[PDB]
């Protein structure tokens, strides 16, 4: 058995950039 790659680095980077999800904020303890 083996564990070799299937997704070349140039194509990998394009799928890696697009597929994630994220969040944002801007609260403060000031009053």
């Amino acid at each position: 058995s083996d564990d070799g790659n299937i997704l070349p680095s140039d194509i990998m980077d394009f799928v890696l950039k697009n597929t994630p999800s994220m969040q944002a904020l801007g609260e403060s303890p000031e009053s």
Partner: protein, 87 residues
């Protein structure tokens, strides 16, 4: 002697639509405009190269489909948990 005797069952329509459906699971795109962008041509050419390598790796049409679908399963369900686990 050669065990390959299945190529005669394939069609150009099957070839076209299987390359297409390879791309849809390799990268589902964020929006349908991203299918048309110039960077998707690298993904498409990679999918064409994979389709031809999985075809050449198979002694039957069933084994060809199995090799396509296993690499599709890896590419889709690895990123679906490494990069999309929260769904």
């Amino acid at each position: 002697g050669v065990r390959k005797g299945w190529h005669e069952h394939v069609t150009q329509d099957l070839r076209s639509h299987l390359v297409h459906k390879l791309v849809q699971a390799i990268f589902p795109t964020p929006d349908p405009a991203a299918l048309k962008d110039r960077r998707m041509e690298n993904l498409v050419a990679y999918a064409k190269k994979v389709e031809g390598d999985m075809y050449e790796s198979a002694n039957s049409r069933d084994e060809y489909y199995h090799l396509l679908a296993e690499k599709i399963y890896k590419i889709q369900k690895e990123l679906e948990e490494k990069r999309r686990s929260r769904l």
